[PDB]
Amino acid sequence: LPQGFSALEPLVDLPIGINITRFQTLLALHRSYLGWTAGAAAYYVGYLQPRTFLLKYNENGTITDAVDCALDPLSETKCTLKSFTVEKGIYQT
């Protein structure tokens, strides 16, 4: 996994009225005709939860930074103050 920050853009939207509960990841592999060989898949799986985020926009309209408002007290202080830099003091959160 990299050590940078990249944002995701909406690729496709679809109108679908069906109910969805499970997904199955299709996989095809090289046929050496010796015929499918061994596999070396390297795909990762994660899941989403409701969270509150604070995002930063530049002059070209792209996203440069973000902060999660519930990770540690400093993040919540930044979330309450509505800023990215703070000074010394005591704050009520």
Partner 1 sequence: ELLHAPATVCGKSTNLVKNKCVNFNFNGLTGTGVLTESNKKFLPFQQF
> Residue 9 Cβ, how far from partner 1 at the closest point, in Å?
6
Q: Is 33 left (phi over 0), alpha (psi -120 to 50) or beta?
A: left
**What whole-number distance in Å separates Cα of residue 65 and Cα of residue 5?**
7
> Residue 60 Cβ, how far from partner 1 at the closest point, in Å?
7
| Residue placing its CB nearer to partner 1 in the complex, 39 or 61 | 61
| Residue placing its CB nearer to partner 1 in the complex, 17 or 35 | 17
Q: Which stretch binds partner 1 (CB under 8 A): 28-36, 40-48, 60-68, 69-77?
A: 60-68
> Residue 91 Cβ, how far from partner 1 at the closest point, in Å?
35
- Give Cβ neighbours of residue 65 (< 8 Å, ≥ 6 apart): 5, 55, 56, 84
**What whole-number distance in Å separates Cα of residue 41 and Cα of residue 28?**
10
End-to-end CA distance of the chain: 34
Q: Determine, following the binding rule CB under 8 A, whether residue 8 of this chain makes contact with partner 1.
A: no
Give the binding site for partner 1 (CB under 8 A).
9-10, 15, 17, 60-62
